[PDB]
Design a protein around this ligand. Sequence first.
Ligand SMILES: Nc1nc2c(ncn2[C@@H]2O[C@H](COP(=O)(O)OP(=O)(O)NP(=O)(O)O)[C@@H](O)[C@H]2O)c(=O)[nH]1
Ligand SMILES: [Mg+2]
Length: 165
Amino acid sequence: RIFKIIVIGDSNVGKTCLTYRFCAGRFPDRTEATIGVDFRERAVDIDGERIKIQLWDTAGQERFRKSMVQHYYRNVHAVVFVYDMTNMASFHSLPAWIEECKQHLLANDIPRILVGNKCDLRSAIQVPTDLAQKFADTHSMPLFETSAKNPNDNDHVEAIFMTLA
Ligand SMILES: Nc1nc2c(ncn2[C@@H]2O[C@H](COP(=O)(O)OP(=O)(O)NP(=O)(O)O)[C@@H](O)[C@H]2O)c(=O)[nH]1
Ligand SMILES: [Mg+2]
């Protein structure tokens, strides 16, 4: 069984790093703005069932994503919205991504979660947890704060995606 999870959010929030961290088990140290359609896969076992989790690493840049959104939303099973904890603007963008999702989803059942990334940059954090939690609550989504680069030692990125499956 294929479980398609799309990862949506502003350019530079770390979507490519999160998806690569989950699928490959390590941080990608060479990344550039994602262009077009990229996805990566990982075979997992949940409760005895072998499942192929397929993470769609969407483009944040308008030029590269504009004609791709119906590919992103084709046969989607879950949605992960990402902001950068060090960039308040990326958090302010979220209502726009959430509305795009609303317009493209048919099934009212599909899980959506909110992820703040780059929590390792403690000194540079701009989005307080309480603010993000209040917003997540308003949209009936759970909130996770994590790091694609460093939080693993806090037991977080794997758990966030696994729990969706
Ligand atoms: N310190 C830190 N840097 C991170 C983390 N995640 C990503 N980065 C860095 O943030 C930058 C953007 O990462 P990237 O995954 O390419 O972003 P993106 O959301 O895929 N961008 P695009 O939408 O344009 O493809 C990179 O320089 C990457 O090294 C993180 O958890 N911690
Ligand atoms: Mg990318």
